[model samples]
Target: MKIEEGKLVIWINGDKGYNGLAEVGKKFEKDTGIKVTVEHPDKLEEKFPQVAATGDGPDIIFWAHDRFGGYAQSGLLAEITPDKAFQDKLYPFTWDAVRYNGKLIAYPIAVEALSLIYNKDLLPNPPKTWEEIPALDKELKAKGKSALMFNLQEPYFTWPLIAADGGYAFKYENGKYDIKDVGVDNAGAKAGLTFLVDLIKNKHMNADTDYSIAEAAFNKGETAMTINGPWAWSNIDTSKVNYGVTVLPTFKGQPSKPFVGVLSAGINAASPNKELAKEFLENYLLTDEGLEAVNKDKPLGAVALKSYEEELVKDPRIAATMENAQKGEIMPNIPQMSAFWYAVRTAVINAASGRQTVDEALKDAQTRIEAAAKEAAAKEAAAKAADTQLFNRAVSMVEKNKDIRSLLQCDDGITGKERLKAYGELITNDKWTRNRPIVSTKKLDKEGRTHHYMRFHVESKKKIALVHLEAKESKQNYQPDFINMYVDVPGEKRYYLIK
Candidate 1:
């Protein structure tokens, strides 16, 4: 391979790892005499391919292993095979995530998986099984706390509940996912779904509970435990809560498993600097110092490098997540997996809200997922295209979980778990919680939904008008049942119907 040199560039997103990436960049340049520029671009994953098509893109791209499959299939990423000795230095399961079509496409830097994170101040030792939660909750209630909490609506957080038996989202065999073999509707999955349903039914969990709410609750020591990944440590450490982490407990003698995500970087196939990119990754980025710098700001949760394991294990959060990662199934990085997130999310929402039975929800999810997966597998997929802010430009809001959905049900914005989490926070904010929503109980939509609207000053600069319709005649915390819209134009009132 001819050495393509001068400067090697990388585009990564996320505040968690940039400080560490920069440290690695400094050392790489110093050692190789090759300049390194790392960029944290907004929507770099989407922009990567578009720019790569014109033969203009960063030499290296950094992201989770899940999105790389599509890029590899699209010829947007270069194949990378680390030496056998180097591969032996990392966890064996670590490479599976970055592998595509039976080939390793990227170098695994970190491993992350959800685990049982508990506030030791609330409960000393975590429960060993789901069966223990009720008794634990009773003890916790004496102190005004709860036994367990997690992002109830998100599939990732709730997966173990539904998969502890024999449930699976898709079949993985021979190093690839058989998308057509969606197992979400299987008996095991249905059984798992029942466990989730019972949790809500028993009043142990709420349908409206979300990530931020759960995180905040756990951080404040108001909840005994939360199922979260190592990435949650930064915010968690900010609080006075004494926390401990462990692998997820059992559902019925079967362990609930969270999906494992591998964070890695790969060479852009279109880049002329593939050789240098490989050098930087395999040589410079593989060292213990390189790994440490990459993980300084946030817990990588699970480091792939065995040499770095001793350092990470010292942090119980990382060690626990690493143990859980080994116990969990590798998240399928294929393009078709994108559909599963929304499909499963909608299923859980349906089941949780009493709209569908656990059985019905699983089958419905299975049906939609298989269909969507079939259609999606026919062409290239756009993975994780979930980032969208309602007030896109020059508007400042104190919160990222802006409840645009509550203000208006149908908006082109965030999707999947984020959207649901955002939905809850949207109505919880001062705009809704601090002030009662203005209601027109008299006016009703053709569907007999009553009208409710609120106009609030957000970012203290611009006015946001929220219009929504709901079945309820009137409510303190208002949310739309059908129509939702936002108009900033002064005194602009409108009803935007759901499509």
Candidate 2:
């Protein structure tokens, strides 16, 4: 790619970091004759996507890592592969949030995750284990005070307890997120849900608590402990609460991990100055010199570079952020993550509000999430309207989408690596199962659809299985909706919704 010399422009949020980067860009301009400009775009999240679609916008964007998936999928963000030495200097987990579809799409600089923020005046130390919490709760209850508080239904906060072991929004494999294999319904997930439910059911914590309430409770010292993130420091000293932040107390012998969010800068795919933008990201923004300048103006909580670890640990809150973020799961940077937020929130809300039992709520969430995630590529407004449907559009073309392929007969059809990797276990492990015929029927009914339906019925001593493969009816968003397999067996019958 040729470097364009018109000007290298970056759209950034207005903050101390923004000012620091603005000054740093001046350094880049001095080092190279090329001019560097940093701008604070109004309504960046909404405005950029619309402008970028027309191949018009800044050369680079400094934003949170959570938006990487959608931006990358829309072809607005460019792929960049940093040298191993440069990547080695940064905290590894930060990269996980900056990658989409196994490709690095952004340069991450800082990380954020929940920590146990408490009022030191009210409680000298935070509990290190979950069992120790109940006694503390009683001690506070005896004095007519609250001990702990946090958002009750927000999935971002609750996921730690739910997926304490095996539960996850989607399964990550080989650097890609598989939406078909959602893990929120696993046994470990149920235990975490139970933990949250008991907190409200037993009056150990407020059932109606939300972020605002959680924050107020701690600020007023009504609650001694509140589960929050590094951002909590912004309003802490104002209250004179004398707070301390620490990694969450262990629950059931496992760490109470929160979601790790990274702040990053990304190149615009449509920009003529791709190479120039990369130079700025590498040498001027993500470097130790650049990071230090930004932190000097504003303490970027939990700096992602290992070079700052020793210096950052000097602050209790930021140190706890690095400690917690090291083990916490990176917020999944996949389009499916959008649907996961909605689905998991609904699941937790239903379970906590007594609308459904925990397991039933999770089952419904699993089904809904799988359906929504499969259509993660769909546009927003048309998707919400009941009138939209993709109808059957024939596949066969293999240029753009690897999975878009010829008609399938259950008997012998090879789908994409994603599909094969998931259900391929039958063909890979059992030789006899591979050779045996899985009588499959392909049906296509009108419109511009690839395949309306493909039914596979496997009947043999190996196992009688029926696979449900059907395409969605949305015209704007066309893709296979679900993968379900039913194993028919006496006294051992079970079905895999693949949720």
Give the best candidate by TM-score. Answer: 1
**What number of clashing residue pairs does each candidate have, in the order they appear?**
4, 17
Off by over 4 Å in 2: 1-51, 54-66, 81-97, 131-135, 141-144, 172-178, 237-239, 271-280, 296-298, 314-319, 353-357, 373-499
Instruction: Give Cα distance to truth, residue 409, candidate 1, Å.
Output: 72
Candidate 1: the clashing residue pairs are 20-293, 403-426, 408-484, 469-481
Model 2, TM vs. native: 0.62
C-alpha lDDT of all candidate models, in order: 0.69, 0.67
Please provide, for model 2 over 19-113, each residue's C-alpha lDDT reduced to its tens digit, 9 standing for 90 to 100: 77777888988998778877887668556667676667778887668776777765677778699998998877777778654457888878777
TM-score for all predictions?
A: 0.66, 0.62
Model 2: how far is 275 from its true place, Å? 5.8
Task: List model 1 lDDT by residue over 1-499, tens digit each.
Answer: 2223478888887635777787788888888788888888876767876676555678888877877876765566776857888889888877877866456788888877888988887777788898889878888788888888889877888898778888887888884467778889888888777878888888888888988899888888888999887767877777868888887999879888887778888887656677788888878777887877776666676688888887778876676776787777888888666678778999998998889988888888888988888777554232211011222211223123345333433244355422211121144225464443321211222232333322233321233443232223335553334344343323444424332
